C-alpha cells in the first residue's frame, strides 16, 4: 500500500498549510505537498507529468510565490495487463498536442499573450 501511504501524507500536508500559519510556512507546507503529489504521479507511471509538476509548479510558481512573500513582511489491482509497445503512451498523447490539438494550442497561446498584456496594464498603476 505504498500509494496509500503517499496519499495520507498528501492530505496531512494539505491540512498543514490549509490552517494558513505564517504564509512562508504555508508555502513550505504546500511545497512538501506538491513533492508528495509528484511522487504519487511518478509512482503511478506518469513520469513526464510528474516531472512537469516538479519543474513548472514547484520551481516556477511556488518560487514566485515565495519571492513575493519575501519582498513583503487497495491499489495495484486496477492496473492494466498488457504493454505499450516500443514507446510510452503518455509521451505520445502529450506530443499529439501539435498534431491533434491545434485549437488548444491557438487558444492557450492567445491566453498567455493576453496574460502578459494584462499583467503589464494592471501593474502600470498611475
Amino acid at each position: 500500500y505504498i500509494a496509500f501511504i503517499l496519499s495520507t501524507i498528501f492530505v496531512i500536508g494539505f491540512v498543514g498549510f490549509s490552517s494558513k500559519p505564517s504564509p512562508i510556512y504555508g508555502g513550505l507546507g504546500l511545497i512538501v505537498s506538491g513533492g508528495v503529489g509528484c511522487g504519487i504521479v511518478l509512482n503511478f507511471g506518469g513520469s513526464f507529468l510528474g516531472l512537469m509538476v516538479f519543474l513548472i509548479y514547484l520551481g516556477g510558481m511556488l518560487v514566485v510565490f515565495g519571492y513575493t512573500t519575501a519582498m513583503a513582511t487497495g491499489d495495484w489491482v486496477i492496473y492494466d495487463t498488457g504493454d505499450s509497445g516500443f514507446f510510452s503512451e503518455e509521451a505520445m498523447g502529450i506530443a499529439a498536442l501539435y498534431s491533434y490539438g491545434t485549437w488548444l494550442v491557438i487558444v492557450t497561446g492567445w491566453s498567455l499573450l493576453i496574460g502578459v498584456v494584462v499583467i503589464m496594464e494592471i501593474t502600470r498603476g498611475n
Binding site: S7, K20, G26, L30, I40, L49, G93, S111, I122, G125
Partner: protein, 97 residues
C-alpha cells in the same frame, strides 16, 4: 478507491481553508493553488488509469492556465499592498453590501 478519496479530501480541505479567511490574502492564493494541484493529481490519475491517450494534454493545459491565473492574482495582491502597506483581508472593506 482510497487513493481517489484522499485526493478529493485534499481538495475539500483546501477549499475549506480558502473559505476560512483568517487573514493574509496570500494564504487565499496558496489555498487556490493547492486546490489546483489536487485537481492536477486527480485528473492525471484518471487519465493514466483508463489509457485515454489524447487526454494526456489536458493536465498540462490546466496547469498552464492555472499558473497564469496565479500570476494575475499575485499582481492584484501587490497593488492592494501598495495601497495599504499590507495584504490584510480586513483592509478591503471600502465596498460594502
Amino acid at each position: 478507491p482510497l487513493v481517489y478519496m484522499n485526493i478529493i479530501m485534499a481538495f475539500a480541505i483546501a477549499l475549506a481553508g480558502l473559505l476560512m479567511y483568517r487573514s493574509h490574502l496570500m494564504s487565499s492564493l496558496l489555498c487556490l493553488e493547492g486546490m489546483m494541484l489536487s485537481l492536477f493529481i486527480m485528473s492525471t490519475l484518471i487519465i493514466l488509469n483508463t489509457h485515454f491517450t489524447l487526454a494526456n494534454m489536458m493536465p498540462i493545459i490546466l496547469l498552464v492556465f492555472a499558473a497564469c491565473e496565479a500570476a494575475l492574482g499575485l499582481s492584484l495582491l501587490v497593488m492592494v499592498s501598495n495601497t495599504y502597506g499590507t495584504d490584510y483581508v480586513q483592509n478591503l472593506n471600502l465596498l460594502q453590501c
